[PDB]
Design a protein around this ligand. Structure first.
Ligand SMILES: O[C@H]1[C@H](O)[C@@H](O)[C@H](O)[C@@H](O)[C@H]1O
Length: 274
């Protein structure tokens, strides 16, 4: 099967939590302004553009914005807007209608509630492309592929600490909600330690089927760049996944990476059953 349409080949009845999904950390940090090129080794986390990542099989993206609706990496402008991102993602789903995309949307200045209101008009323009439930529904249950076909599962992260509610509909769910387990030890861990946490989280992910696992392979430190961690960790993660596939262990959750190589993404995909 093609990496461009790998989810379409999966059974409609499969739960989102039962899959091994390749994703990218700080998805848009593959280009940026002058400050971006000056701090390139510290800030860059990807080489492939958004459309290229989607075509390569990535189904989980990490978009970080500010109330001006532009994409940022802290104080660094990434030469992209949320509209441009939304249009790209939406075009991909229109072309490949069975795929689904998990999208973490973070506010870079978590000090304001103005982010929630400002993004609403833009998100509303693409309402037909978002997985949505009624406001009253607090079921929190993880959807089935049938329900998210050709749609975006939004994971909101901002000051309000609540899910994006536009009109009477609740858009996606809250990032960090009780139905998702997150491993995000980014703050300078040793390679050995980081690997243990990745492996432990993947192990726990296999035993459960009622929660979403966001397992970050990514990290930084004052003396080790994202590029350096990826070069050490990605291959180790890849071989671990290859092994588990032999033991018939599937549904490892969302493996969120920096600088993922095409072959690595394919092997994570192959962990699912077709
Ligand atoms: O710099 C970190 C890092 O990128 C983590 O992966 C992300 O989850 C945190 O929100 C962010 O502050």
């Amino acid at each position: 099967v093609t990496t461009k349409q790998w989810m379409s080949a999966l059974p409609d009845t499969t739960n989102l939590a039962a899959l091994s999904i390749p994703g990218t950390h700080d998805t848009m940090s593959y280009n940026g302004d002058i400050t971006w090129t000056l701090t390139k080794p510290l800030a860059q986390t990807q080489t492939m553009s958004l459309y290229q990542q989607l075509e390569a099989g990535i189904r989980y993206i990490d978009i970080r914005a500010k109330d001006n609706l532009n994409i940022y990496h802290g104080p660094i402008f990434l030469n992209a807007s949320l509209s441009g991102v939304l249009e790209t993602i939406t075009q991909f789903l229109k072309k490949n209608p069975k795929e689904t995309i998990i999208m973490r949307l973070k506010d870079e200045q978590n000090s304001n509630d103005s982010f929630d209101y400002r993004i609403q008009p833009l998100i509303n323009i693409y309402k037909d492309y978002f997985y949505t439930t009624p406001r009253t529904d607090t079921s929190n249950k993880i959807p089935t592929l049938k329900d998210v076909r050709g749609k975006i599962l939004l994971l909101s992260e901002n000051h309000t600490k609540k899910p994006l509610v536009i009109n009477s509909r609740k858009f996606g769910m809250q990032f960090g909600a009780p139905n998702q387990v997150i491993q995000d030890d980014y703050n300078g861990p040793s390679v050995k330690t980081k690997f243990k946490e990745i492996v432990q989280t993947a192990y726990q992910a296999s035993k459960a089927d009622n929660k979403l696992f966001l397992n970050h392979i990514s990290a930084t430190s004052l003396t080790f760049t994202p590029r350096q961690y990826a070069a050490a960790l990605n291959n180790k993660v890849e071989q671990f996944v290859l092994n588990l596939t032999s033991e018939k262990v599937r549904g490892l959750g969302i493996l969120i990476m920096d600088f993922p190589e095409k072959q690595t993404i394919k092997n994570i995909i192959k962990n699912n059953k077709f």
